Design an enzyme around this catalytic site. Structure first.
Site, PDB file in Angstrom:
ATOM      1  N   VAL A  35       0.851  -1.107   0.000  1.00  0.00           N
ATOM      2  CA  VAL A  35       0.000   0.000   0.000  1.00  0.00           C
ATOM      3  C   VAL A  35       0.937   1.219   0.000  1.00  0.00           C
ATOM      4  O   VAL A  35       2.137   1.133   0.371  1.00  0.00           O
ATOM      5  CB  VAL A  35      -0.969  -0.157   1.191  1.00  0.00           C
ATOM      6  N   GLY A  36       0.416   2.332  -0.496  1.00  0.00           N
ATOM      7  CA  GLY A  36       1.060   3.638  -0.274  1.00  0.00           C
ATOM      8  C   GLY A  36       2.412   3.916  -0.918  1.00  0.00           C
ATOM      9  O   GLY A  36       2.985   5.009  -0.700  1.00  0.00           O
ATOM     10  N   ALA A  39       5.519   5.608   0.627  1.00  0.00           N
ATOM     11  CA  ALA A  39       5.146   6.826   1.371  1.00  0.00           C
ATOM     12  C   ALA A  39       5.116   6.613   2.892  1.00  0.00           C
ATOM     13  O   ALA A  39       5.462   7.506   3.684  1.00  0.00           O
ATOM     14  CB  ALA A  39       3.793   7.350   0.890  1.00  0.00           C
ATOM     15  N   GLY A  41       5.877   3.356   5.817  1.00  0.00           N
ATOM     16  CA  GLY A  41       7.125   2.547   5.841  1.00  0.00           C
ATOM     17  C   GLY A  41       7.011   1.485   4.764  1.00  0.00           C
ATOM     18  O   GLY A  41       6.474   1.726   3.634  1.00  0.00           O
ATOM     19  N   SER A  42       7.458   0.278   5.037  1.00  0.00           N
ATOM     20  CA  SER A  42       6.949  -0.709   4.103  1.00  0.00           C
ATOM     21  C   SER A  42       5.690  -1.219   4.784  1.00  0.00           C
ATOM     22  O   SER A  42       5.760  -1.762   5.874  1.00  0.00           O
ATOM     23  CB  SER A  42       7.951  -1.805   3.773  1.00  0.00           C
ATOM     24  N   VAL A  43       4.560  -1.003   4.129  1.00  0.00           N
ATOM     25  CA  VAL A  43       3.204  -1.297   4.706  1.00  0.00           C
ATOM     26  C   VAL A  43       2.482  -2.080   3.623  1.00  0.00           C
ATOM     27  O   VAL A  43       2.498  -1.648   2.411  1.00  0.00           O
ATOM     28  CB  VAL A  43       2.407  -0.030   5.068  1.00  0.00           C
ATOM     29  N   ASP A 173       1.827   7.978  13.566  1.00  0.00           N
ATOM     30  CA  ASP A 173       3.213   8.436  13.309  1.00  0.00           C
ATOM     31  C   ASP A 173       3.625   9.702  13.961  1.00  0.00           C
ATOM     32  O   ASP A 173       3.786  10.718  13.267  1.00  0.00           O
ATOM     33  CB  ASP A 173       3.527   8.571  11.811  1.00  0.00           C
TER      34      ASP A 173
END
EC number: 2.7.11.24
Length: 359
Positions: A35-36, A39, A41-43, A173
């Site tokens: 996802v993302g 942008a 973290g690694s998610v 965050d």
């Protein structure tokens, strides 16, 4: 009642390539999609076959790289374990595929999948006044909770607000360890929401730094544009003073900078602008709330709890449903430790994690 478990089984893990790397998770998680686009973290989004809900899983792959990383990892884990609120990101799970400390390297964190950050929401939606009340209400409800634990966010911007398709919002965050940033393309959305106090290191500041950020965000939700899109620190300050008015002798005496005092005094003086002229077509209670948030004097700025009671949130506000946090013991912050020392403490927090109950 007095029956105790005499041992425990490690979940089985499986491995796969995601984002060009090796994600190795318990077989509890299925269908991990990135996802993302970096942008965050690694998610990876996933399906949690345990709780039967979509989740987000984040991999910290550089946590103990240095003493500064290692303490930050421990910090973020102690914070995330602590936060148990509807509008704050907390943890469904935290795991590692390490069978022992001697093997411990990667930490993974798991929370409820939201599916968007607020930037994304604003980009495809002119939000109604009702959506503004509800989103801002939830930001303040989360901050009332965070602040009651003596924690400050310090960044707070739309990219730190996760929102789902039901317009539910959680705060992500906190502002000391908050992904990869600096300056890659443009200025990105990084300085525009920051309290002036902290932008130019003024006092020791207070929690109402986050309320300045809320006002900036709320202003954007209403108008659809960035309130103070400064090009650098100084420009950002000018754009701010153009609206709120150059601070008076008394407010200046309250700051300990030699640089800021002398800088701001060379600047042509300006009176506070009429906020009804800037925030056009908005609910007047919305405007009145902005006037209490976007004040330069930290001692005169509205608190998270004060703002919750503001007539703008009448539909949503409910003093019985605005919880406060347990005291949060930040003793560990006054320690000067080595890597393999922040790392064992972190390993102790992973293995001692207790999951929320089902339901």
């Amino acid at each position: 009642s007095h029956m105790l478990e005499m041992s425990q089984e490690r979940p089985t893990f499986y491995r796969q390539e995601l984002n060009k790397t090796i994600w190795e998770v318990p077989e509890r998680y299925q269908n991990l999609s990135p996802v993302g686009s970096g942008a965050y973290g690694s998610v990876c989004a996933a399906f949690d076959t345990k709780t039967g809900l979509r989740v987000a899983v984040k991999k910290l792959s550089r946590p103990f790289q240095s003493i500064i990383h290692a303490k930050r990892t421990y910090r973020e884990l102690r914070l995330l374990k602590h936060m148990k609120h509807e509008n704050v990101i907390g943890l469904l799970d935290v795991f590692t595929p390490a069978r022992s400390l001697e093997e411990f390297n990667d930490v993974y964190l798991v929370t409820h999948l939201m599916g968007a950050d607020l930037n994304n929401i604003v980009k495809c939606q002119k939000l109604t006044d009702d959506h503004v009340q509800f989103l801002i209400y939830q930001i303040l409800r989360g901050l009332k909770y965070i602040h009651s634990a003596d924690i400050i966010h310090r960044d707070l911007k739309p990219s730190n607000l996760a929102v789902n398709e039901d317009c539910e919002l959680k705060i992500l965050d906190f502002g000391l360890a908050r992904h990869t940033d600096d300056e890659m393309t443009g200025y990105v959305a990084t300085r525009w929401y920051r309290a002036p106090e902290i932008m130019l290191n003024w006092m020791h500041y207070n929690q109402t730094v986050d309320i300045w950020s809320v006002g900036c965000i709320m202003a954007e939700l209403l108008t659809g544009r960035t309130l103070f899109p400064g090009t650098d620190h100084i420009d950002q300050l000018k754009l701010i003073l153009r609206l709120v008015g150059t601070p008076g002798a008394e407010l200046l005496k309250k700051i300990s900078s030699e640089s800021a005092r002398n800088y701001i005094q060379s600047l042509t003086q300006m009176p506070k602008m009429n906020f009804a002229n800037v925030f056009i077509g908005a609910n007047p209670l919305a405007v009145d709330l902005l006037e209490k948030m976007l004040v330069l004097d930290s001692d005169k700025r509205i608190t998270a709890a004060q703002a919750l009671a503001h007539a703008y949130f009448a539909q949503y506000h409910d003093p019985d449903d605005e919880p406060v946090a347990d005291p949060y013991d930040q003793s560990f912050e006054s320690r000067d430790l080595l890597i393999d020392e922040w790392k064992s403490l972190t390993y102790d927090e992973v293995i001692s994690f207790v999951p929320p109950p089902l339901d």
